[PDB]
Structures are given as C-alpha cells and as structure tokens.
Amino acid sequence: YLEAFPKELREYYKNLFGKEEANKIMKKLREPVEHYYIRVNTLKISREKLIGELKKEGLKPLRSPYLPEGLYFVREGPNFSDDFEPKLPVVVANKYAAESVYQGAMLYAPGVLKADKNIKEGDEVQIRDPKGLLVGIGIARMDYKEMTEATRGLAVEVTLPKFKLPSLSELKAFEKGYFYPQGLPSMVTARVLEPKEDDVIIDMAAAPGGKTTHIAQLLENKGEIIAIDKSKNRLRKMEENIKRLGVKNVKLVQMDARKLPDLGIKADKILLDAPCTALGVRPKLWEERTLKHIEATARYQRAFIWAAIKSLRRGGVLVYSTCTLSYEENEGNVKFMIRKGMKLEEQSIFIGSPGIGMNKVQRFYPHKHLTQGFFIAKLRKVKD
Numbered sequence: 510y511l512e513a514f515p516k517e518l519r520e521y522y523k524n525l526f527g528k529e530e531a532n533k534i535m536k537k538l539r540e541p542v543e544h545y546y547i548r549v550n551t552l553k554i555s556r557e558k559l560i561g562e563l564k565k566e567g568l569k570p571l572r573s574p575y576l577p578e579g580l581y582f583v584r585e586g587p588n589f590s591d592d593f594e595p596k597l598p599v600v601v602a603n604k605y606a607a608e609s610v611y612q613g614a615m616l617y618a619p620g621v622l623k624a625d626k627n628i629k630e631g632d633e634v635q636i637r638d639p640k641g642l643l644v645g646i647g648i649a650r651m652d653y654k655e656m657t658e659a660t661r662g663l664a665v666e667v668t669l670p671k672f673k674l675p676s677l678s679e680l681k682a683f684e685k686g687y688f689y690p691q692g693l694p695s696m697v698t699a700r701v702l703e704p705k706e707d708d709v710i711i712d713m714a715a716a717p718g719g720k721t722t723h724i725a726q727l728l729e730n731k732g733e734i735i736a737i738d739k740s741k742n743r744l745r746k747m748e749e750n751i752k753r754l755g756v757k758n759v760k761l762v763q764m765d766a767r768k769l770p771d772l773g774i775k776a777d778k779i780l781l782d783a784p785c786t787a788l789g790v791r792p793k794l795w796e797e798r799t800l801k802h803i804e805a806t807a808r809y810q811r812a813f814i815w816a817a818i819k820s821l822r823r824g825g826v827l828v829y830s831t832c833t834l835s836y837e838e839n840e841g842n843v844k845f846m847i848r849k850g851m852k853l854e855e856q857s858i859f860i861g862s863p864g865i866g867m868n869k870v871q872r873f874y875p876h877k878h879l880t881q882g883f884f885i886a887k888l889r890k891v892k893d
C-alpha cells in the first residue's frame with residue numbers, strides 16, 4: 510500500500526506521526542471508510558422515521574450515540590486479497606471510474622479506458638485502474654467493441670468489488686431530501702460551531718453546501734446563513750442541494766473569500782472549511798499531492814484565515830476545518846491564528862484525537878476513528 514504515497518510524503522508522515530502510526534494511517538487511507546455516514550435532514554424527517562424508510566430498501570443503517578442526526582452503514586470488504594491474480598481478461602477503467610468501482614459502483618462505458626479484445630458479453634473480467642491496481646471483478650455486459658465505443662450504458666456488472674458501500678444517490682429518500690451524505694468529522698464540525706438563530710453566520714467556502722445545510726437544520730431554518738464560494742458550478746450544485754433539502758435559510762454569494770472584509774459584515778460565527786491538500790480523504794488509490802503542495806496550500810489558507818479574523822466581531826467564533834493530515838495546514842496555521850488575537854476554546858463534542866503538540870484542537874485518523882483524516886479548530890477572537 511505504501512506505493513500509493515510518494516517517498517517524500519511517506520518520510521513526512523513517518524516524521525510527523527512515527528513510523529508505526531504513519532504506516533497504519535497510509536494503509537487505512539487506501540481503503541474506503543469503514544463507517545459510511547449520512548446526515549438525517551431533520552428539516553424534513555426524524556432519525557427513526559428515515560431508518561424505517563431505509564430498512565424498506567434493504568439497507569442496514571446504524572445509529573450514532575454521539576450525533577442524533579447521525580446514521581452510518583458498515584463497509585463490506587476487502588472481497589479479495591491484495592495480491593490476488595485472477596485469470597481473467599482485463600478491463601482498464603479511467604482514474605475516476607476505478608475509484609467508484611473500488612467501492613461498489615458498476616462500470617459504465619464512458620468509464621472504460623481500454624480493454625482486452627477477446628471480451629464478449631457474459632465474460633467474467635477483472636477491472637484495473639490505469640496503474641494496474643485491481644479494483645474489482647465482474648461480468649461484461651458489452652462486447653469489447655461496444656465497450657470502447659459506447660457513450661453510455663453498462664459495460665461491466667461489478668459483482669465482486671474490492672469494497673462495497675451502499676449507493677444512496679438513487680434512493681427515493683435521497684430525492685425527497687431526507688438525508689445528505691457527509692462524514693462524521695464534518696458533522697462534528699457544524700455542531701462544534703454551535704450556531705444560534707441570532708448569530709450572524711458565514712460559511713466562506715461553502716459549496717456544495719454540506720456543512721452549510723447542516724447549520725441550516727440546526728438553526729431549524731431560522732436566522733440567516735451567508736454561504737460563499739468562488740466556483741459558480743459548485744454554487745450551482747449547492748442551489749440544487751438547498752432546494753432538495755428544503756433549506757430556506759441560506760444566502761448564496763459568489764466571490765473570492767479572501768476578500769471577505771470587503772463586505773460590511775462583522776460575523777459572530779464563521780465556519781472556514783478551507784480548501785486543502787486533502788491528504789486525508791478516502792479511498793486513496795494514489796496520492797498525487799506532496800510536500801510542495803502542503804506549503805503552497807498552507808500559505809493560501811492564511812489569506813482566508815486573516816480575512817475571517819478581520820471579519821469577526823470581538824468575542825466572535827471561528828471554526829477552522831480541513832480534510833488533510835499535514836501539520837502546516839492545521840496546527841501550524843492555528844499558531845498563526847493565535848498570533849493574530851485568537852484564542853483556543855474547548856469544543857462541545859470531542860471524540861477524535863488531540864492535536865500535534867496542541868491541546869484543544871481535534872484530529873480524526875482513519876485507523877483510530879474509522880473516518881477520513883480530518884482536523885477541527887475552534888477559536889475565540891479576544892481582540893483585534
């Protein structure tokens with residue numbers, strides 16, 4: 510599994526976590542989350558009602574004892590050994606299709622990069638990513654020719670994915686806005702913000718609106734949430750999420766969030782779920798980002814942070830979060846915040862790990878908490 514991570518990043522992890530822990534993290538990082546979480550949209554439905562609805566579809570949701578809005582599914586797999594060499598013709602899926610197949614998705618024709626020419630419908634085939642990673646085994650539903658030419662349709666019915674997560678996008682319950690897929694650390698993030706109906710609230714990197722709509726339901730569609738993103742398409746997707754979830758609480762604004770103080774707003778609560786190297790996301794088939802990205806991105810996040818601090822009322826609260834493992838983007842950038850008049854505060858929910866040489870910030874690790882790698886800092890602005 511180590512091959513999935515560039516050598517200098519591996520040295521970095523060993524340095525930052527210790528050889529043993531670093532190895533446990535990387536190994537788990539290559540696998541999908543063991544507990545696949547969704548958020549109950551309490552704007553439309555209760556947890557127990559939704560559970561009943563999901564059981565109807567043959568799904569087995571489990572309750573979180575920490576998040577009354579939390580449900581999760583237990584991951585299946587691995588369904589074959591890491592060294593398994595099936596005696597089967599190969600279908601090569603592109604980088605994106607391979608990752609979804611890795612978690613139980615079917616392989617559709619546009620996802621097919623190339624294939625063995627002997628393949629006919631009904632043949633058993635193995636599916637590999639462009640680097641030879643075996644991600645699944647299944648039955649071809651197209652001949653070789655149609656597979657490499659079709660613009661739509663089923664190419665391989667994946668009957669033996671390496672891992673299996675439930676597909677929730679096609680459920681009636683999803684179309685009716687009953688839930689929103691979202692990791693446990695992400696849900697904790699919104700709770701720890703403790704949004705109030707009175708608070709002036711800003712999500713300055715909000716699309717596609719996962720944490721924003723979570724705040725919305727905690728506010729019970731009262732108050733107002735200002736949600737900022739630079740991307741119009743991602744804001745376009747966020748508009749759809751809002752409508753589906755029945756969120757009436759949110760004001761969208763397109764802009765570079767680093768220029769946030771250009772508004773005349775002094776917020777009481779700011780969520781900064783900052784763009785990051787995403788070193789913690791799962792599954793991690795191949796890590797492309799490395800040390801140069803950590804420094805550049807960390808420096809890039811500071812602009813957001815500074816913008817937020819200047820836009821906070823004194824006594825105001827900032828919650829900073831990333832889906833990355835690096836020190837620089839996390840604890841290092843919090844030290845930055847501490848030098849700029851911010852004070853660390855106890856978070857209301859703490860089920861993860863302590864930070865690196867740092868007490869009140871919260872980390873999540875895939876090997877310890879069955880989640881993506883994650884980081885949460887909650888700060889109070891004591892002075893300007």
Ligand SMILES: Nc1ncnc2c1ncn2[C@@H]1O[C@H](C[C@@H](N)CC[C@H](N)C(=O)O)[C@@H](O)[C@H]1O
Pocket residue numbers: 713714715716717718719720721737738739740743764765766767782783784
């Ligand atoms: N300078 C920027 N200004 C505003 N938004 C940005 C900027 N750079 C990146 N973003 C957005 O930051 C977001 C990063 C997302 N991963 C955040 C997801 C969000 N927290 C959610 O709960 O769904 C993307 O939507 C980016 O479009």
